[PDB]
Design a binder for this molecule. Structure first.
Ligand SMILES: *C(=O)[C@H]([C@@H](C)O)[C@H]1CC(SCCNC=N)=C(C(=O)O)N1
Ligand SMILES: *C(=O)[C@H]([C@@H](C)O)[C@H]1CC(SCCNC=N)=C(C(=O)O)N1
Ligand SMILES: [Cl-]
Ligand SMILES: [Zn+2]
Ligand SMILES: [Zn+2]
Lengths: 237, 237
């Protein structure tokens, strides 16, 4: 691990504070603007959709990425949530009601055992099974996110290879002639997350970032700040 | 099937001739500028990488999308070919030596049976096992390409679901907040191919196009012409 304090300019020039963590897979080396905050644990918020979807698929709660989850008919504030979804669109739109339904069907016992087998964060599901990742006791740091993501990339998590490929499919966010990004956003009204990886021809760069997000105004800064670091480091054009 | 002769403006305004075929999955309806050429069979050229990779994976010739195929040490004219590749980069760079090696390991007997089970084109492997898709007798039309692609999308081809997901992963070409394109290019010095599909939130549009390509000058017109039709039809922004 290597601290590059010069990356802080990417946060400060947007009047922002936070951390970006990168991991070069081929070289087994990591880089961050702030080593301390890189190991500070936070609520995972919607980034928990990754472990949640893996367990749901492995347990048969979800059949595949095109199976339809019917909207329960309760209208919620996020307009995109009030409709039928599959795994692809549930991830893209961070559709909490779908993931709460996943968690209820999984149950507390299977959830806790599976998170332990994943070595995910602090492994604490207290106390609502359908809302612990939002307002309970589970916490994960940026470096622990990368640790979890590396296992998923290599199909080394303690679930079926098929479950892992399907979740990696659903993580697809961006792709062009130079790179592929699979990732997941999160927001809990206090902090904002962006965790994933960048696939290249001959390497992969894992990333985890979070930042203070007092208001929804600048949620877009999560992706923008990350891409500016990737550009600076010549990872993407 | 419905012929929209107005799409020909997309070819003629580039001094080009060819066909674009689209298929609306949700509505089960197809559209093309030229119904005749839509059913005209051509050499598949590098688009054969899709069936070839499926059979190789199902037979164990390829383990997964990150397994390394060592370059044989013969330098060929395409600079990108003279190096180690995996399934991802073999598809992106259309690396013929890798696919010829696949075909040799598969063999004529298994190749012919598998193409028949796929109902792929005319199902004629004459006569070089490692070069028939380039200069042999196999031929496929644009509508037959879509027929093959629909089965792959639904995991309905006569191979493992795992093999089909891995090939669909390797077909990834482009992705943003509005759509995902999985596809494969082809070029045989006479005609140029672009076959695949566009994934949306709630639908999929399959496509197959080919055009006369006398010189390498305008290979980029394959993607450009296709995207202009998609834009005209309000499939992508
Ligand atoms: C997850 O972190 C949250 C949810 C649990 O509060 C969802 C909600 C949002 S913002 C809603 C509007 N979307 C704007 N893009 C996100 C998010 O990551 O943006 N995740
Ligand atoms: C497949 O159709 C051919 C090969 C069998 O001749 C390959 C070669 C090319 S062009 C080589 C340089 N690349 C430019 N982009 C393609 C192609 O589809 O572009 N496929
Ligand atoms: Cl994918
Ligand atoms: Zn076990
Ligand atoms: Zn059979």
């Amino acid at each position: 691990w290597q601290e590059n304090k010069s990356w802080n300019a990417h946060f400060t020039e947007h009047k922002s504070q936070g951390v970006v963590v990168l991991w070069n897979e081929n070289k087994q080396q990591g880089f961050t603007n702030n080593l301390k905050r890189a190991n500070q644990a936070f609520l995972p918020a919607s980034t928990f959709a990754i472990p949640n979807s893996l367990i749901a698929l492995d347990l048969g709660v979800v059949k595949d990425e095109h199976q339809v989850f019917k909207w329960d008919g309760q209208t919620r504030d996020i307009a995109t949530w009030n409709r039928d979804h599959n795994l692809i669109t549930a991830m893209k739109y961070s559709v909490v009601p779908v993931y709460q339904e996943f968690a209820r069907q999984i149950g507390e016992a299977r959830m806790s055992k599976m998170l332990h087998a994943f070595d995910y964060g602090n492994e604490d599901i207290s106390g609502n099974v359908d809302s612990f990742w939002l307002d309970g006791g589970i916490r994960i740091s940026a470096t622990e996110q990368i640790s979890f993501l590396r296992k998923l990339y290599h199909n080394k998590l303690h679930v079926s290879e098929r479950s892992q490929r399907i979740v990696k499919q659903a993580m697809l966010t961006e792709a062009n002639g130079d790179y592929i990004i699979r990732a997941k956003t999160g927001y809990d009204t206090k902090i904002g997350w962006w965790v994933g990886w960048v696939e290249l021809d001959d390497n992969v760069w894992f990333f985890a970032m979070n930042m203070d997000m007092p208001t929804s105004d600048g949620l877009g800064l999560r992706q923008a700040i990350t891409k500016e670091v990737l550009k600076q480091e010549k990872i993407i054009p």
